[PDB]
Design a protein around this ligand. Structure first.
Ligand SMILES: [Cl-]
Ligand SMILES: [Cl-]
Ligand SMILES: [Cl-]
Ligand SMILES: [Cl-]
Ligand code: NA
Length: 129
């Protein structure tokens, strides 16, 4: 599913993400924009053989099982394919675990390089939230 900007903002809000660990909704929508272009089915292979999945490009190295990342963990206790559903519940609940682990949203490279310190409220501007 390719979300619209405000559509995704409202879904993330419904699921607990706005202001989660202090990160305003615009930070999450910006991160999704640059990680996946709002496509729940986005995958990208990393040089080390792990793979990033879903709207927030969650990495099989630590967070989900795909059966093909030797030595990896599955800290969200999910198959990585659950991170590709049109329903964002599994991605949101795993992202809540990621953003609590110490480094906040710096876990998302696209957020640090393209959202951090910018006007992230622009990503929810005009949305009927
Ligand atoms: Cl915001
Ligand atoms: Cl594996
Ligand atoms: Cl949803
Ligand atoms: Cl933080
Ligand atoms: Na894994």
């Amino acid at each position: 599913k390719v979300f619209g900007r405000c559509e995704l903002a409202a879904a993330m809000k419904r699921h607990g993400l706005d202001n989660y660990r202090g990160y305003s909704l615009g930070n999450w929508v910006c991160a999704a924009k640059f990680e996946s272009n709002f496509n729940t089915q986005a995958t990208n292979r990393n040089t080390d053989g792990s793979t990033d999945y879903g709207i927030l490009q969650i990495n099989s190295r630590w967070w989900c099982n795909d059966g093909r990342t030797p030595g990896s963990r599955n800290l969200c206790n999910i198959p990585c394919s659950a991170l590709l559903s049109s329903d964002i519940t599994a991605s949101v609940n795993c992202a809540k675990k990621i953003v609590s682990d110490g480094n906040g949203m710096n876990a998302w490279v696209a957020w640090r390089n393209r959202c951090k310190g910018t006007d992230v409220q622009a990503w929810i501007r005009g949305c009927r939230l």
